[PDB]
Structure 1
Amino acid sequence: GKSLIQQRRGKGTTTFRAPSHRYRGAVRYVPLNLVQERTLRGVVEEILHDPGRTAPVARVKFEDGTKKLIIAPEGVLVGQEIYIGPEAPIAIGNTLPLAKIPEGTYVYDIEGVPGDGGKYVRAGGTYALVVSREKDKVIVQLPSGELKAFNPMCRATIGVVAGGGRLEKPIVKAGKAYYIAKARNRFWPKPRGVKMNAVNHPHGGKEHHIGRPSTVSRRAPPGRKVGHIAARRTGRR
């Protein structure tokens, strides 16, 4: 038989790669063999649009003369002064360890293990809620529902991610979607296996129907996992 788009993506061709040369750099915090307790102070100088982030970025100049990119919170001004460390104040744009952060605070850009650089709640519009503070773990509510546990030395940022309310206005045409998907080269347009041929898909035929249940096992081999994968249920409710 023939292959799937699933299967050709895994090789890394220009038809599937990300055009990262078009983007602004990566967004990490600072390495913490440098941030023992010193509570760096910095100044925002620019706010900019990144084609790979679904969120604005902000350029910061520190007292070291070093320049970094952060993810911009909602309501940060060009000219402000943000602090990064354990004893910094509690405001919008300031990065602290979760232990020092009360219960009820909104939070973004959380590290998984202390030192990573920021793994959670970095998409535009998103936030997390602090629930509890033990001596061995902090519980946090993520934008999906999960109540995850983090070690209390992990770092987060206070406030909300800008860019919110992005999916309210419709995409009206197909050329606009062309441009949105050409920015980051997503596969667009999309075909349907039901209207493909039998070499090219587990569905596929002269009749444009599926002749087997769309539910597939988590132990089905590659080339066959198409549809609903390990579906607990289906339907409307």
Structure 2
Amino acid sequence: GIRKYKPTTPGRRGASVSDFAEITRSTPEKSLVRPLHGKGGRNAHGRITTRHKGGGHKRAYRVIDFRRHDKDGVNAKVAHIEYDPNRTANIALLHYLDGEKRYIIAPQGLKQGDVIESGANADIKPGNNLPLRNIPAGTVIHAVELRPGGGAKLARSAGVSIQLLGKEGTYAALRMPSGEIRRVDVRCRATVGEVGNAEQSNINWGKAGRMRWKGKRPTVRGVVMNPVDHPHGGGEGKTSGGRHPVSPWGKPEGRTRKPNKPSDKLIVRRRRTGK
């Protein structure tokens, strides 16, 4: 859930934090911990490509198994539920009965001791991973592959889920969290249930420093930049831009999806706005 801080400081007035309640262990599993280093939003050239990134608390990568293909029929038990800074969701440490230890996305309803099944002959329970050919319609799923073997791409964030609407042929229709309906090969695998830590959205981070810890550098508005820096720049006194809204590189608002894409035929219905 959520712990609302008390207003002992102005940087804590309306602030909130997670009550790390479904979490059981403060420490991660060392074998599954790869290192990480910040980039600063900078690429191989050393140049800012994505702005508003840097500083940030040090982090370490928990090796998640988004590709749960090699443990079919080999059950596991959720040994722990842990915090992952790399993602909004929490992560569940599973002990496979063959001795393999792995991390997953920690769906809702999942606790220590819950037994996780993988494969076609698995039960339709939270945390169980199956092909969509074996998952029935109207089911709530997460961590879906876009391609067989490609690994889970979809419905990975906290509180989020995908609704499997139907299967017609070798294509399963999926209502996505954005509302977009799209087709995906039934061979693609999905984890049953909805992702946990859905309370995450309702956190008030209270102060600038907290997002500086999360690695979000300050976002400056164009209207207070100079015209050399931003199209919206300039003006004596405040301005609304002096023109229609654009990016700092002058690209206007509007659809940036490349047309004539391969996914256009798999997509059934783009998401909706305003309604």
Query: Residue 225 of structure 2 aligns with which residue?
Result: 196
Query: Residue 62 of structure 2 aligns with which residue?
Result: 25
CA contact under 8 A between 1:82 and 1:94: conserved in structure 2? yes
Taking the aligned partners of 1:200 and 1:9, their CA distance within structure 2 comes to 19
Q: Provide the secondary structure at the position in 2 that maps to 1:91.
A: coil
Listed as ranges, the gaps of 5+ residues in structure 2 are 1-40, 257-273
Q: Kindly tell me: are residues 120 and 30 of structure 1, through their superposed partners in 2, closer, same or farther at Cα, counting changes over 3 Å?
A: closer
Of residues 108, 111, 115 in structure 1, which corresponds to 2:145? 111
Write the letter of the residue equivalent to 1:182.
Answer: R
CA contact under 8 A between 1:52 and 1:184: conserved in structure 2? no
Query: Residue 3 of structure 1 aligns with which residue?
Result: none
Q: Kindly tell me: are residues 131 and 57 of structure 1, through their superposed partners in 2, closer, same or farther at Cα, counting changes over 3 Å?
A: same
1:76 equivalent to 2:110? Answer: yes
CA contact under 8 A between 1:47 and 1:59: conserved in structure 2? yes
Query: Residue 51 of structure 1 aligns with which residue?
Result: 85
Q: Kindly tell me: are residues 130 and 116 of structure 1, through their superposed partners in 2, closer, same or farther at Cα, counting changes over 3 Å?
A: same
How do 1:125-204 residues align onto structure 2 when only pairs under 5 Å count?
125-168=159-202, 170-171=204-205, 173=206, 175=207, 177-179=208-210, 181-188=211-218, 190-204=219-233
Q: Is the deviation greater in 158-167 or in 44-53?
A: 158-167
Write the letter of the residue equivalent to 1:39.
Answer: G
Q: Kindly tell me: are residues 115 and 224 of structure 1, through their superposed partners in 2, closer, same or farther at Cα, counting changes over 3 Å?
A: same
Write the letter of the residue equivalent to 1:229.
Answer: E
CA contact under 8 A between 2:63 and 2:102: conserved in structure 1? no
Deviation of 1:19 (Å): 6.3
Give the paired residue count.
212
Deviation of 1:204 (Å): 1.7
CA contact under 8 A between 1:60 and 1:67: conserved in structure 2? yes
Write the letter of the residue equivalent to 1:28.
Answer: D
1:212 equivalent to 2:243? Answer: yes
Query: Residue 154 of structure 2 aligns with which residue?
Result: 120
Deviation of 1:191 (Å): 1.7
Deviation of 1:80 (Å): 1.8
Q: Kindly tell me: are residues 118 and 50 of structure 1, through their superposed partners in 2, closer, same or farther at Cα, counting changes over 3 Å?
A: same
Deviation of 1:12 (Å): 4.6
Q: Kindly tell me: are residues 92 and 61 of structure 1, through their superposed partners in 2, closer, same or farther at Cα, counting changes over 3 Å?
A: same
CA contact under 8 A between 1:215 and 1:230: conserved in structure 2? no
Write the letter of the residue equivalent to 2:253.
Answer: I
CA contact under 8 A between 1:44 and 1:78: conserved in structure 2? yes
Question: How much identity, in percent, do the aligned residues show?
Answer: 32
Cα-to-partner distance string for 1:121-173 (whole Å, 9 max, x where unaligned): 101011111111122211010111111101011100111111113333544x4
CA contact under 8 A between 1:215 and 1:231: conserved in structure 2? no
Write the letter of the residue equivalent to 1:199.
Answer: V
Taking the aligned partners of 1:74 and 1:223, their CA distance within structure 2 comes to 41
Q: Is the deviation greater in 79-88 or in 160-169?
A: 160-169
Q: Provide the secondary structure at the position in 1 that maps to 2:117.
A: strand
Q: Provide the secondary structure at the position in 2 that maps to 1:166.
A: helix
Q: TM (normalized to structure 2)?
A: 0.68
Q: TM (normalized to structure 1)?
A: 0.78
Taking the aligned partners of 2:146 and 2:105, their CA distance within structure 1 comes to 17
RMSD over aligned Cα atoms: 2.8
How do 1:86-105 residues align onto structure 2 when only pairs under 5 Å count?
86-105=120-139
Listed as ranges, the gaps of 5+ residues in structure 1 are 1-7, 217-221
